[PDB]
Amino acid sequence: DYVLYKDATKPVEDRVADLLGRMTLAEKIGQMTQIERLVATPDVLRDNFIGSLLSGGGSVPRKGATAKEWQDMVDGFQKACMSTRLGIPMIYGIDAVHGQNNVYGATIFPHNVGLGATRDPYLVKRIGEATALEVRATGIQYAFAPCIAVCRDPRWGRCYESYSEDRRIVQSMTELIPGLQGDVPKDFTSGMPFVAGKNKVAACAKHFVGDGGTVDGINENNTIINREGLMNIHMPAYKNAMDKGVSTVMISYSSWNGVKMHANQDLVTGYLKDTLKFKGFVISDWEGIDRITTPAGSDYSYSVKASILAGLDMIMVPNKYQQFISILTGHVNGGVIPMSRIDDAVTRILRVKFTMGLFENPYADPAMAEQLGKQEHRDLAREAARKSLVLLKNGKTSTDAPLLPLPKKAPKILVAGSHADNLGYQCGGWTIEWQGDTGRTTVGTTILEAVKAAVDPSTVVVFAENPDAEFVKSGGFSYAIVAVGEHPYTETKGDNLNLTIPEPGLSTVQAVCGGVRCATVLISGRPVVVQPLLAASDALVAAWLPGSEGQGVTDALFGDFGFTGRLPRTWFKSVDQLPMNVGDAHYDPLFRLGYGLTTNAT
Numbered sequence: 001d002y003v004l005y006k007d008a009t010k011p012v013e014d015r016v017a018d019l020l021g022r023m024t025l026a027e028k029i030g031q032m033t034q035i036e037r038l039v040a041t042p043d044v045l046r047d048n049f050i051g052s053l054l055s056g057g058g059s060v061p062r063k064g065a066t067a068k069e070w071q072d073m074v075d076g077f078q079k080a081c082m083s084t085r086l087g088i089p090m091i092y093g094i095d096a097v098h099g100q101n102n103v104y105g106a107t108i109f110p111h112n113v114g115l116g117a118t119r120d121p122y123l124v125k126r127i128g129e130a131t132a133l134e135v136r137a138t139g140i141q142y143a144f145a146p147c148i149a150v151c152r153d154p155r156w157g158r159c160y161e162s163y164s165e166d167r168r169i170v171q172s173m174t175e176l177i178p179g180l181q182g183d184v185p186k187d188f189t190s191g192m193p194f195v196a197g198k199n200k201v202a203a204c205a206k207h208f209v210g211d212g213g214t215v216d217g218i219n220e221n222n223t224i225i226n227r228e229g230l231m232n233i234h235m236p237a238y239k240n241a242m243d244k245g246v247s248t249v250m251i252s253y254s255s256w257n258g259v260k261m262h263a264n265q266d267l268v269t270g271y272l273k274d275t276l277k278f279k280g281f282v283i284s285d286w287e288g289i290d291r292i293t294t295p296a297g298s299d300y301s302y303s304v305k306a307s308i309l310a311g312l313d314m315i316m317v318p319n320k321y322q323q324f325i326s327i328l329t330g331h332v333n334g335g336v337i338p339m340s341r342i343d344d345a346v347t348r349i350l351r352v353k354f355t356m357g358l359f360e361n362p363y364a365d366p367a368m369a370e371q372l373g374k375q376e377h378r379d380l381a382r383e384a385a386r387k388s389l390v391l392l393k394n395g396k397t398s399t400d401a402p403l404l405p406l407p408k409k410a411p412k413i414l415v416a417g418s419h420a421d422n423l424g425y426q427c428g429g430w431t432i433e434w435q436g437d438t439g440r441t442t443v444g445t446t447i448l449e450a451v452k453a454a455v456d457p458s459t460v461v462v463f464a465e466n467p468d469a470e471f472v473k474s475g476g477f478s479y480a481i482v483a484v485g486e487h488p489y490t491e492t493k494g495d496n497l498n499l500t501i502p503e504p505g506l507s508t509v510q511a512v513c514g515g516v517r518c519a520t521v522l523i524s525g526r527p528v529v530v531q532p533l534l535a536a537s538d539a540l541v542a543a544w545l546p547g548s549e550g551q552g553v554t555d556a557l558f559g560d561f562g563f564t565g566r567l568p569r570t571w572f573k574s575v576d577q578l579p580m581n582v583g584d585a586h587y588d589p590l591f592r593l594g595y596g597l598t599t600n601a602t
Ligand SMILES: *[C@@H]1O[C@H](CO)[C@@H](O[C@@H]2O[C@H](CO)[C@@H](O[C@@H]3O[C@H](CO[C@H]4O[C@H](CO)[C@@H](O)[C@H](O)[C@@H]4O[C@@H]4O[C@H](CO)[C@@H](O)[C@H](O)[C@H]4NC(C)=O)[C@@H](O)[C@H](O)[C@@H]3O)[C@H](O)[C@H]2NC(C)=O)[C@H](O[C@H]2O[C@@H](C)[C@@H](O)[C@@H](O)[C@@H]2O)[C@H]1NC(C)=O
Pocket: 438, 487, 488, 489, 493, 494, 495, 496, 497, 498, 499, 500, 502, 503, 504
């Protein structure tokens, strides 16, 4: 007879109910299961009725894979899923968190902290738009973004993934969501999922909740704050996300007052689902349910019970799907987890899939491949990089001529420092590899390349990575641009109690600026100890992690545009002050939140 769920003209809720009513337990639990492409095969996907796949950081079909290679990979998986009895298409997720960043040749946008510096939500919306296109270029339908953490301590390795320590700024930047997904209709009910169609992607507000509030910025640790503080600081942007139709929410590894978020029924079900009326699906973090216990994974049966009863809908396993499916099936058969809970999880997963058009367009569009690294998107990244820059110093005394903007015509100039010609360093973590990497890892323009592209043809440009003082004094230079800062990092590898940049960095700045007037470009994911760098430098720019388009940096250095970025975080005098956020009683910053010098275009 007629099969309602296969009818594209029918309301989503009717299609959901019609399909749900046909499904076996195995088919239901399969929808709730997300697995790594590294463990996926056609038989696995078909036999286990798998609902989702992902690429974790650096999980790629081949180094240097083309957009079409990604499309072929995703379509291969999709063909297996579509060959099941019910033909429910899988959704494929990836961390596209500053562009489609795992992919070779994808445009790499500034990380969130720099976007916060721009105070420009419309810019961020347009970045969401470009990112959706580059993700769809690779056949992928689901981005694990935005991170709406409010980082309250820059010792956290994910501080760069937070737009600001100020929740108001984070709330404003939720505009990423309608960029990625499309704008919601005028009729729209807050909490409903939304994706406009095949040229957009499902988004994910993460990580719920208080991931940016952990003690001493220890990643995945305990957020110790009363309910009033949680609701006033860490929660608000989730409400904006509901209002904008975010399709999914990912749960945090962190705990709130000692209760694991992955086990917190009060917050996941009581608040997110029952109070905020969230109707999309809730996904775990990577082995998030494993990490409920100490040691992690030492009671996986408990992990499954606790997380599913808490209200999680989809589990990012991501590897041991056999164990997950077996345990969950056992719990349901034994009445420990009710069918109502399973049906709710599946209802939400199917709701997102039908809403976004996945049943109508389960396969990649080969015409989209050329969206990857498209020059217009690079022009946008370049605009964002330039707007993110915060000018902290522009002259050593009130009597000095401002160093910036620099003249494009000079007899000879010096470009120096570990970060002047290192594309991987300027992109930071979550670029090609999970932890990021060093050197020419993708298509882009380094600061050195940007300088050479900007200056008058008569200007001789000399590069020296770590010149000594004599080299500089003898070189006949008009000025120097020197770039130094943090190495790429992600998650726990970035947790750092001292926040001092690696050497050589300061020593290079001192040697260069001791010999010639010098503009220091600081590449970092966060405020770092900066007084010594300031003391040496004529001008100093906090460039954050500006991404693949290094010309954004030189657009401001050479006065094509004026500096406009303002600190989205407090710049501390010392790490012993931390945590120290705007509005605190003891507030003694080196530079307050919102500080930034300006220049005018030449
Ligand atoms: C303040 O606290 C932070 C965080 O705890 C700490 O930085 C970490 O230091 C760890 C211990 O030294 C270090 O762990 C080791 O890393 C070894 C390899 O590390 C290189 O490669 C990784 C990426 O794989 C980078 O992240 C590292 O920064 C490092 O990179 C190299 O650095 C040098 C020096 O600038 C540079 O010339 C190279 O080009 C560059 N290479 C690349 C590929 O980029 C590894 O072999 C060991 O087994 C061990 O795991 C950890 O990586 C680092 N974390 C970071 C930077 O995120 C600071 O202490 C150290 O800083 C490092 C860079 C080094 O100079 C040490 O001597 C410092 O003590 C702390 N600062 C203090 C205490 O002053």
